[PDB]
Design brief:
Chain A: It comes from Homo sapiens (Human). The structure holds two protein chains of two kinds. Chain A is an all-alpha fold. Chain A is 73% helix and 0% strand. Chain B has one domain: Retinoid X Receptor (Orthogonal Bundle). The chains are: A mainly alpha, B mainly alpha. Bound molecules: the ligand *c1ccc([N+](=O)[O-])cc1C(=O)Nc1ccccc1OCc1cccc(CNC(=O)c2ccc(CN3CCN(C)CC3)cc2)c1.
Chain lengths: 11, 268
């Protein structure tokens, strides 16, 4: 999923 | 002419690098050489000096909730997590990066961060040790080596890479562009759209080439030496990734941070 990485990138 | 656009790219990357990474190579070198008006870093060369240094380096601030080799590793882990955050912020400043497909941004970061971590460690390192805790500590190479397996072997390949990589004598303005090039590698496994990545990297490499010509005119084919190290580094990171997956499974009392798990899962 890469949930945290996604969060760091989008925000 | 076209050089001017490349020079502006170099400068834009420098400025964003400076914002993204609080501890620059310049600051780290100032510290390591004593060309600084701040106090000298506390030296941690053994068990007892680790205990003695705890206030100066704020070692108990890692675990607000263990064995030593584990505690040192958690410290390393703590900083790595922040390094991934800094690398991620810097990546967003690279022109074109955030218009890439979000799965590709993720993939580029997932493979790139470990390579960049090696270059970040090199800035903090000499032959004998590594700066820790925001420059307040210095942990010797032999102390890290003397840790029990598998922790004893973890930092040493990064020391090996660093001594070679440091002989190139890059500064922050070089590094800013080199790091951009690593991130935008169109040959990472699982990339959807290789083309807009390679288009960006092409401009970054040209920027890197010109930067190195201008900043190191006496150093013939530094660009070439640099690209060869970048290839060496991929090969090296494969073994680093292997050792962590080993440690995760083989050490029960050590928790691997979720972000770091994300970046180690399904990797080589
Ligand atoms: C190490 C272990 C595991 C991984 N991993 O990917 O699973 C990565 C790393 C790692 O790469 N470390 C790393 C990456 C980039 C830059 C530095 C870095 O590291 C530095 C390092 C290396 C070896 C040992 C240590 C030990 N660190 C500490 O003991 C430590 C103590 C305290 C703090 C922060 N603390 C005090 C300062 N406050 C302001 C904040 C709280 C940090 C580290 C570190």
């Amino acid at each position: 999923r890469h949930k945290i990485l996604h969060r760091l990138l989008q925000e | 002419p076209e050089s001017a656009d490349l020079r502006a790219l170099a400068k834009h990357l420098y400025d964003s690098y400076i914002k993204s990474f609080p501890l620059t190579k310049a600051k780290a070198r100032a510290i390591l050489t004593g060309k600084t008006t701040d106090k000298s870093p506390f030296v941690i060369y053994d068990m007892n000096s680790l205990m003695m240094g705890e206030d100066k380096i704020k070692f108990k601030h890692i675990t607000p909730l263990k064995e030593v080799a584990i505690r040192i590793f958690q410290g390393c882990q703590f900083r790595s997590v922040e390094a991934v955050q800094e690398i991620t912020e810097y990546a967003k400043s690279i022109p074109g990066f955030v218009n890439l497909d979000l799965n590709d941004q993720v993939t580029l970061l997932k493979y790139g961060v470990h390579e960049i971590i090696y270059t970040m460690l090199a800035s903090l390192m000499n032959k004998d040790g590594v700066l820790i805790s925001e420059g307040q500590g210095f942990m010797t190479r032999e102390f890290l080596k003397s840790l029990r397996k598998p922790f004893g072997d973890f930092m040493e390949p990064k020391f090996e890479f660093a001594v070679k990589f440091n002989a190139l004598e890059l500064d922050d303005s070089d590094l800013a562009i080199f790091i951009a090039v690593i991130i935008l590698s169109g040959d990472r496994p699982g990339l959807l759209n290789v083309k807009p990545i390679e288009d960006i990297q092409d401009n970054l490499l040209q920027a890197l080439e010109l930067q190195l010509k201008l900043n190191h005119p006496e150093s013939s084919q530094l660009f070439a030496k640099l690209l060869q190290k970048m290839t060496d580094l991929r090969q090296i990171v494969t073994e680093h990734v292997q050792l962590l997956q080993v440690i995760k499974k083989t050490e029960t009392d050590m928790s691997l941070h979720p972000l770091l798990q994300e970046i180690y899962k399904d990797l080589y």
